């Protein structure tokens, strides 16, 4: 029944909790710094939520934005060697969503793809949305639907748990044109 201030009180939290509860809150706390939501381990930026979009605009100029709830994410050059990243932004319902495609090295020459959407917003806000990722090919279709992650949470855990759209190179070839992959992204509200 002794109460401790949140470690992010200096940033404005005002929550005080029993030690039993302290870390569980501090992991979820809105006043926790946001890390750069871009894929890969190159950018080490951190800041508040309101600083994220300007950051992305200053430091990640190549990232393109599309307005609309229903768009096509065309990842080019998917067979180009290494582990690689694709990222773009989708604007709708008064929010920005980051679309990420990530290629990883798996067991042998075989590689795996992970595709996922994050909300540029809080976890609570993230709960109001759903997204759908669609791969389309000749007489085929692969679909993944879920709740977007808040960038507060990030995608490392989701991707690690296959909690996103997961497919490997052979799957990729079925849906690819040239060396490019079209991903249909549809956002909706719950």
């Amino acid at each position: 029944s002794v109460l401790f201030p949140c470690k992010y009180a200096s940033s404005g939290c005002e929550i005080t909790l029993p030690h039993t509860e302290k870390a569980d809150h501090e992991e979820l706390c809105e006043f926790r710094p946001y890390s750069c939501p871009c894929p890969g381990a190159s950018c080490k930026w951190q800041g508040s939520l309101d600083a994220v979009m300007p950051h992305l605009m200053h430091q990640h100029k190549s990232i393109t934005t599309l307005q609309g709830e229903d768009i096509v994410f065309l990842a080019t050059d998917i067979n180009l060697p290494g582990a690689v990243d694709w990222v773009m932004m989708q604007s709708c319902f008064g929010f920005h969503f980051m679309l990420v495609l990530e290629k990883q090295e798996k067991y042998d020459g075989h590689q795996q793809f992970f595709a996922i959407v994050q909300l540029i917003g809080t976890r609570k806000q993230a709960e109001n949305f759903a997204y759908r990722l669609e791969l389309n090919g000749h007489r085929r279709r692969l679909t993944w639907e879920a709740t977007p992650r808040s960038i507060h949470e990030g995608i490392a855990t989701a991707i690690m748990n296959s909690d996103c759209l997961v497919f490997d190179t052979s799957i990729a070839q079925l849906f690819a044109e040239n060396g490019n992959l079209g991903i249909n992204v549809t956002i909706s509200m719950c």
């Binding site: 890969g40 393109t64 599309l66 609309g68 096509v72 994410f73 065309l74 080019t76 180009l80 990222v87």
Partner: peptide
């Protein structure tokens, strides 16, 4: 419902 060519991060 448009499309966007996205190149690898680099």
């Amino acid at each position: 419902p448009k499309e966007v060519r996205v190149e690898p991060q680099k």
